Paper text:
The APOBEC3 family of single-stranded DNA (ssDNA) cytosine deaminases plays important roles in innate immunity against viruses and transposons. However, a subset of APOBEC3 proteins, most notably the nuclear-localized [name] ([name]) enzyme, is strongly implicated in causing mutations in various human cancers. Human [name] consists of tandem zinc-coordinating cytosine deaminase domains: an N-terminal domain with a pseudo active site and a C-terminal functional catalytic domain.
The crystals have two protein monomers in the asymmetric unit, each containing a zinc ion bound in the active site. Loops 1 and 7 of [name](187–378)QM_Δloop3 in the new crystal form show different conformations from those observed previously. In both A and B chains of the new structures, the loop 1 residue Arg211 is flipped out and, instead, the adjacent residue Arg212 projects into the DNA-binding groove and interacts with loop 7 Tyr315. Importantly, this trans conformation of Tyr315 was also observed in the open state crystal structure of the A3Bctd active site bound to a TC-containing ssDNA substrate, where the Tyr315 side chain lines a hydrophobic pocket that accommodates the –1 T base. However, in our new apo A3Bctd crystal form, Tyr315 in this alternative conformation maintains the cation-π stacking interaction with the guanidinium group of Arg212. Accordingly, Arg212 in B chain is positioned differently from that in A chain, but is still blocking the ssDNA-binding groove.
Author numbering: 190 to 223, 232 to 241, 250 to 378
């Protein structure tokens, strides 16, 4: 399994919501039977990482008889205005053996309809939450070519996480 460069992780999962950023997304995934698959995806040539994960589901050769928990540690919450939330809704509505957890570093405020994405994902059975120190360090330890270096928090990690978490819980009340 391949690991991402540390600077790519840090640049993409920094959770300060008031920074101007390129609209790139990184999505670290793990899939476990409730038989594991792990990896990471970014947007490529206009196709969002969420859809690329859906693209690769068949290649994972999951047993249609079993239940699987899929976890996404995603740098941006999935969009509405470019169809991600709806495709994820479709996927989950049919593939009822998949339970999806979405832990987002940041809310995708670049999408005017981001709240509709969050609400739609919830209504389809996905568990959506905001990444905390725990998740950032887990992703550093699990998906990053860190060469034994411990995780070091960026300025404001905990504050941003708590503010975004309050936003998200307010939206999904
Ligand atoms: Zn999208």
């Amino acid at each position: 399994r391949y690991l991402m460069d540390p600077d790519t992780f840090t640049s993409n999962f920094n959770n300060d919501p008031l920074v101007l950023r390129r609209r790139q997304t990184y999505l670290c995934y793990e899939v476990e039977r409730l038989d594991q698959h792990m990896g990471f995806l970014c947007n490529e040539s206009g196709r969002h990482a969420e859809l690329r994960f859906l693209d690769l589901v068949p290649s994972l050769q999951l047993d249609p008889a079993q239940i699987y928990r899929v976890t996404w540690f995603i740098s941006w919450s999935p969009c509405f205005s470019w169809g991600c939330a709806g495709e994820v809704r479709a996927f989950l509505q049919e593939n009822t053996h998949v339970r999806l957890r979405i832990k987002a570093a940041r809310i995708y405020d670049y999408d005017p309809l981001y709240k509709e994405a969050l609400q739609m994902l919830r209504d389809a059975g996905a568990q959506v939450s905001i990444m905390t120190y725990d998740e950032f360090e887990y992703c550093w330890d699990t998906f990053v070519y860190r060469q034994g270096c411990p995780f070091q928090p960026w300025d404001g990690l905990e504050e941003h996480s708590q503010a975004l978490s309050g936003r998200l819980r307010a939206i999904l009340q």
